DNA sequence: TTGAGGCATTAACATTTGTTAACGACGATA
DNA sequence: TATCGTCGTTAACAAATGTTAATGCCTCAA
């Protein structure tokens, strides 16, 4: 991404150097509140919450380049208890703390519009997953999330869509999609096959009828179209 | 309700006069998409949504002073295609193009944090209640939202903490959490009722047990606390 | 006064999902 | 080569929710 690039560079400019993350870790998390601001340039991630149960919810999944943060701007205090996996091999992501970004976007305008769309970005995309996974129940749920690592972790292959991800267990997709028990999420996978909605492949799934998620998660296919077009074309 | 209302001046400071609306009426809709920026400084609106299929959903509520965006700040682009309604006796707000809030935002800095600021409400409202509806499927849901009923228009009475809403029938807590029907709906606060949760008088809601809803929506009423505590603290 | 329409409640029944358990396939370790 | 643990399936039963229909309470309009 260009903006993202000369933003990288604007943070180096004002001593802001990149810190090296590996699998498992987390960034911050729920227990120790910092608040600061994560430019996540590269690797991927995942912001989870654990309940007072130790329930594991998956919210949404994070790809370099992009901004989280676990704090406000003016007031300073925090946004929520949210913990940032890295679950790729190694992760690259930029650590500011939130008091200095006030002065280091008051003297740029470029890289705050930037900033602010990316919020944008998040806004619009966590009302359409709440859109989708909210009418057809969890079998849209699952369904829902499939069309999201399809538009973003996949690729055309003659056997069918492949999804570039490792460690993609059942549990994992039921952390995403609010499923506690393994054996619900493969029994509606279960079905997404029969139907050969899906296929597994080793390392992978593969998605062969896109067509099917988009019925079920209509919103979030059109949130891709409106957000992230260069994306979604590369799948129609 | 400060930083809002030097807000309010600096907008009709510039040629920005308000509008003014009615119940039922329709600021921006899904169906005819223009990108606006709205400013709902006073009354109650609901984001809505209407699928292809005719089902209804209720995204969430808006009430003033805040911002809604209708469009992306730079590309100009709809960041979705959402209904924001009036249901309101009344509502006064503030609508500007987006390609006119660059220019009016750029210059003036501190309404600048204001803006951002209140999207940052709006991702961790986002995040926290897709949090507590994903975990205990439609039971939650409602209790979720019962619970952010309690907080923004709950008012304490002797026979509990009264919801002053008008309508919240039925139907509309279910586009609200995520129910079709209206008669399952009522199953659920059937047995809250039974529960000694809530109750029912003057045609209105009283919260009675507001702690059983916080077990059922424990991050939204964390987001209370972090995002507005003097609305929190109004019940603790 | 009657009669129409909407909202709330319940029923019953179908469908989904929650929950636990058992089986097998795979890898890893000694 | 045997054994332990992890994960993917399926079974089986319980709970929740989807779906439709019927009944009652209320307002409204002639």
Redesign the interface.
Known sequence: NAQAEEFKKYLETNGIKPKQFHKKELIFNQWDPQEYCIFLYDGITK?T?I??NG?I?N?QYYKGAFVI?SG????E??????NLEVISEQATAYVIKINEL?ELL?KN?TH???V??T??K???Y??????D???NGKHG?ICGQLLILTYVYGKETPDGIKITLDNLTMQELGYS??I?HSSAVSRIISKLKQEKVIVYKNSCFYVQNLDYLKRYA??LD??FY??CPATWGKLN
């Open positions: 912001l919450s309940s007072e329930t919810m919210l943060m406000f701007i003016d007031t205090t925090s946004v929520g208890y949210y006030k008051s305008l705050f519009f930037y602010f769309q919020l944008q998040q806004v619009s966590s009302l359409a997953k709440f859109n996974f909210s009418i749920s999609s609010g506690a209509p919103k059109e949130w409106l957000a």
